[PDB]
Amino acid sequence: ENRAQVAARQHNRKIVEQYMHTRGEARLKRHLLFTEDGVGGLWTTDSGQPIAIRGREKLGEHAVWSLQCFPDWVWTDIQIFETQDPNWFWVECRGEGAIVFPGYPRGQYRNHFLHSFRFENGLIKEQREFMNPCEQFRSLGIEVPEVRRDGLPS
């Protein structure tokens, strides 16, 4: 059993590395790292609900939009964490690039990210990314509310 778990973790780690280093036109094929029913998306948004992309085919379609809205995106400072589950990895990283959202001025977006990767039969079953949406608001020129801190320790 341990030999099967070690083998799974070593293989899955390679897929995480491949995912995090996928850049440029290769992003059009990143959905091939998922199971057919795999899910990916952004779990931290202004609405409080994830923006989840369901299915390898929808993931491929999203990559088209991704390359338009984030045309030179790179992940940096990548740290991959294996876990006691050979099929579950976490990644801490930063990400940066131009942001070209419909109806907003072109901007530069930089943020800190956590990624969750869960695997099934050698491919990604669920990818989730977590960030602070306030930094994306800033990149789009959107005003960020400020919690008043006068009454708080400083």
Sites of contact with ligand A1IAM (CB under 6 A) = 41-42, 45-46, 51, 53, 65, 69, 133, 136, 147, 149, 152-153
For residues 94 to 133, the per-residue mask of contacts with a copy of itself, x marking binding by CB under 8 A and - elsewhere, is -------xxxx-------x-x-x-------------x-xx
| Contact partner, 4, from a copy of itself, ligand A1IAM, none, Cβ < 5-8 Å per class | none
| Contact partner, 41, from ligand A1IAM, a copy of itself, none, Cβ < 5-8 Å per class | ligand A1IAM
Cβ contact 142:126 at 8 Å = no
Taking the least distance from each CB to a copy of itself, the nearer of 19 and 89 is: 89
Taking the least distance from each CB to a copy of itself, the nearer of 37 and 92 is: 92
Across 35-55, b (16+ Cβ under 10 Å) vs e yields: beebbbbbbbeeeeeeeebeb
Considering the rule CB under 8 A, would residue 47 count as an interface residue with a copy of itself?
yes
| Burial class (CB within 10 angstroms; exposed 0-12, middle 13-18, buried 19+) of 148 | exposed
**Whole-angstrom Cα distance, residue 112 to residue 131?**
6
* Residues across the chain: 154
